[PDB]
Amino acid sequence: ANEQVLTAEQVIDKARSYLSDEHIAFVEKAYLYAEDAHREQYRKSGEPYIIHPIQVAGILVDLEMDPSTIAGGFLHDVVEDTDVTLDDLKEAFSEEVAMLVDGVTKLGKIKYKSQEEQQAENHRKMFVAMAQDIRVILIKLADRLHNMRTLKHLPQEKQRRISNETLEIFAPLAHRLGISKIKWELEDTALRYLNPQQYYRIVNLMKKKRAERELYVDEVVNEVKKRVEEVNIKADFSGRPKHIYSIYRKMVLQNKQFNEIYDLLAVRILVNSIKDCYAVLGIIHTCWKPMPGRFKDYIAMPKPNMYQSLHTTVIGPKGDPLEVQIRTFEMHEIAEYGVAAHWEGATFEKKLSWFREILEFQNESTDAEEFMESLDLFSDMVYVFTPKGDVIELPSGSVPIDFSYRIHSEIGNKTIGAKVNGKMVTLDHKLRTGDIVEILTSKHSYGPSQDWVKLAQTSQAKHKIRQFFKKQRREENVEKGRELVEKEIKNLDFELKDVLTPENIQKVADKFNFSNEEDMYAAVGYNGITALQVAN
Amino acid sequence: ANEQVLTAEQVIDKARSYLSDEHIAFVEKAYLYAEDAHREQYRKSGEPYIIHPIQVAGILVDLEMDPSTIAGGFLHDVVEDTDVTLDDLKEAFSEEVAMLVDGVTKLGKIKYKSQEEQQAENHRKMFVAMAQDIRVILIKLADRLHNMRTLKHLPQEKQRRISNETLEIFAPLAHRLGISKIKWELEDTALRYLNPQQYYRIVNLMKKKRAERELYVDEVVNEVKKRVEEVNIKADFSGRPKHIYSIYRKMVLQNKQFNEIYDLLAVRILVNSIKDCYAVLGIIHTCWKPMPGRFKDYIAMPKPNMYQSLHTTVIGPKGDPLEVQIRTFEMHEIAEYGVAAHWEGATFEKKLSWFREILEFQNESTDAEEFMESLDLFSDMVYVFTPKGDVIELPSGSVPIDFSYRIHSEIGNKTIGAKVNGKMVTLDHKLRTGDIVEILTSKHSYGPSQDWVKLAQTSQAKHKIRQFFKKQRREENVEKGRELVEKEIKNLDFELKDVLTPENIQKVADKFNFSNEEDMYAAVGYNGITALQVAN
Numbered sequence A, B: 001a002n003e004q005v006l007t008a009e010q011v012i013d014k015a016r017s018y019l020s021d022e023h024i025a026f027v028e029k030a031y032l033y034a035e036d037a038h039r040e041q042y043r044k045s046g047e048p049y050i051i052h053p054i055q056v057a058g059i060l061v062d063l064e065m066d067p068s069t070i071a072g073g074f075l076h077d078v079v080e081d082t083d084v085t086l087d088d089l090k091e092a093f094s095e096e097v098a099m100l101v102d103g104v105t106k107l108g109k110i111k112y113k114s115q116e117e118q119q120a121e122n123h124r125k126m127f128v129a130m131a132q133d134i135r136v137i138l139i140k141l142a143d144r145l146h147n148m149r150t151l152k153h154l155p156q157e158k159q160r161r162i163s164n165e166t167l168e169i170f171a172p173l174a175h176r177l178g179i180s181k182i183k184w185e186l187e188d189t190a191l192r193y194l195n196p197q198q199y200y201r202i203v204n205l206m207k208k209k210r211a212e213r214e215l216y217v218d219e220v221v222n223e224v225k226k227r228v229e230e231v232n233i234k235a236d237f238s239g240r241p242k243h244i245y246s247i248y249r250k251m252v253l254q255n256k257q258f259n260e261i262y263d264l265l266a267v268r269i270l271v272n273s274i275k276d277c278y279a280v281l282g283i284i285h286t287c288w289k290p291m292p293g294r295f296k297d298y299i300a301m302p303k304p305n306m307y308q309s310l311h312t313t314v315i316g317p318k319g320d321p322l323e324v325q326i327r328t329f330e331m332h333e334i335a336e337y338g339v340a341a342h343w344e345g346a347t348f349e350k351k352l353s354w355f356r357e358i359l360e361f362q363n364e365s366t367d368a369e370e371f372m373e374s375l376d377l378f379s380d381m382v383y384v385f386t387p388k389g390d391v392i393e394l395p396s397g398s399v400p401i402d403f404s405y406r407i408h409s410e411i412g413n414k415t416i417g418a419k420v421n422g423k424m425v426t427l428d429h430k431l432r433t434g435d436i437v438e439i440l441t442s443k444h445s446y447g448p449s450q451d452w453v454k455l456a457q458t459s460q461a462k463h464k465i466r467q468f469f470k471k472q473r474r475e476e477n478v479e480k481g482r483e484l485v486e487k488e489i490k491n492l493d494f495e496l497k498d499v500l501t502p503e504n505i506q507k508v509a510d511k512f513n514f515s516n517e518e519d520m521y522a523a524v525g526y527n528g529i530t531a532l533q534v535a536n
């Protein structure tokens, strides 16, 4: 059960799968240089020299990085391990590859610090100063990952020290950049050496219940898709296996004994848009009761490492907890491969600076690893729920009036009150995201008031209110131009015309050839003398 | 048939409908000052003095402008018409109101220019220099609108000269700012004096056919909503009456005789989102054949005056032409009341500068009033059609692979070719917006290739391709770890084990307690010696 060592041709072809011929030639020259560098110069364990740089470059290609990063990973242990120097590499390929390799070597030359967070900050500072980018950090993370994969050949004390350095520096740094695969693998492979007893205990504890958990998952997945595809929203997804080191992270927390750890490796749901995300949220909330306070909105409040999802723990099946996760495919790419997945005339000027800034804030974020509300009122769209499960979007600052007019026009016109998550609110009340809103309606009502056009936020609601008021004005002027001028014209003189009310007078009113007959009456709301002389 | 003169209390209450008490006090003080300014100082025609500023301020409130603009409209004819000077106004209220009133008066003091476009540019330059904003321009447009409304009391030559100045300067300027109501009213009321014969001819020509046109509309509206509400997308809308001066604009064009003017005052459709706009577009294209080249996308290529809609002329009912318009409610607010509808610590710094820039480009846009493709590849979402009418969104640069994977996962995996609007295209072909795409599918196919992950643009398609390749790798390693090691272990020695193939060896393979039994076979794709010794 050891994943094999890949050859160089496979890595070159997998890089060719997403690169052009020039980058392929660059990485091939780098590979040949790395081969000719350590020739007749092998490891202490007797294993060939090029296996380690080849695996580092393969892990880097697995992240699909820039060709300079892959060349540096091929040439990361060439300067101080062989006769080739830094000037040789700078003359060979470029100055940037030299910077990357020199940074990797410098971070290989580490120093002890009195404090732990301070040595983490020193490892961060070396990078940030020598490379605002992560290319050096990525190459070093690949080096450490391959070291963790081939650690069993080393003495046990060295194994434990390397695993400690990984758990205290490299794995939290990988978490800082959003690269989650490397984080999980480093954490698991470090716990395997630091505490093999707890590692295998967690493994064989997950073993017994993962069968009934697969059944729980399959059933909940089936029900979820059967109730989601009805609202005509497609979503490819699967179950999320909870990795071991997170189990130990919550396990060592004395309160969170393994039994009834409330996260129980629930299902993730990948979908196309954010509105679809919140629709799936509402559907899951309507299919099962959510546990209070167990909802986390990492979309409107993204994690500082760009993580973006939606977590909610519900009652679900027979088993009490299930913490469903919902995110989009871009959000999945981010939450999986961080900046490397994210990675214009010059696309490397603002990129590395923003990455340095996100790392300079993620240091403080790692000093307090949990929620630690960040920054905000930046989001423009709030997604509100209907009690049945439907989720509708509104501009931030929208009122329940906008909600009602978004549901239906007639439903909006006859609005009286509003209930936000079971609370009698005012129509002026602002709408947050996620809260469930239901409006009070009755056809026995005149309609809106003059204040509705002011306190509304959605343009649609304002438009419909203007339309309603204009219709009312038209009917008002028509009632005037019927009754008031039906008397005012010839109060006594039309007594015959009050006896005989024919349609020929309609025709003599049509010779004015205004827009409409209803308009023939509506114009009277302004002028009353025109039809006063043409009563003939 | 003359719309009445509104009082001051009505305008103050309508401003109160969307303002606070302080702005109401400001506009009330401005109104009282305007009343006491021209007291015992009436017009040449004998009409009271305050009617004109009151109507100007009422038109400004109808646009719901800032209180300073309404105060200036109340006080636009106070400086040079009364004893009150500019310093009096500057000491009374502020410096900004003084700037606005002085600009209005300066543009009332106009100069003749040798060229027509040059005098239009002079009228633009006076504004832009004295006010990068439109507040002065808005007050002057309201002044000119009220002058056009009360023009019948003036001599005919003065009527025609004022209407000419309106048609050559004020109406095109209102069009420059996107304010369309004022543009239409000014154009119609100017054509009424400049060419009453053609005005009333167009009126009584529209009269005869507008009945059958109302029938055509009602029927098309009914069919459209009946076929749109089925796809579960709501849209409030109505018919769009074609104003008279546009009829004359196309009529004076010798080719476009009134008969079969291809625009025939078709229906507009207001909807919530842009995706809904293009969905309505596809539905209308599937219900009736579109006329070639009669489609205009003013959403992806907005008019320089911020106009944003979607026009398409189709065959429709018995009658040959019908040019349906589709836009959102924000787009409707824009296309109706321009910048005044559009109108942060300081919200007036960038606003007026951007408005000045849009006017400095709309001058050139008015020198060539028609399409005049502007700027671009700025839009991020391309909306593609399915031949049935469904419209799906993609990121710009998406390939038909992304389209197929967006339709369905299985449909995507078995993709072979693609047809864009009836043309056999490559899967590498980039997708424009609006074109109809249909992919070729067949379950007799292995699946994607290594190039698909590269040339795809949607993250969802890349994710599904990675998943497919990983499933194939798993099954490949399982086939290996069945056959190759089923022989390689004990080629002759397991002849008994080839005779007896029981499930107890499955149990001795389960004592390794790896993840899954399928994983018990999949791990053999890397290591083949572990199960070689435990054949017992």
Ligand SMILES: [Mn+2]
Pocket (backbone or CB within 6 Å): A052, A076, A077, A143
């Ligand atoms: Mn190394």
Ligand SMILES: [Mn+2]
Pocket (backbone or CB within 6 Å): B052, B076, B077, B143
């Ligand atoms: Mn005036």
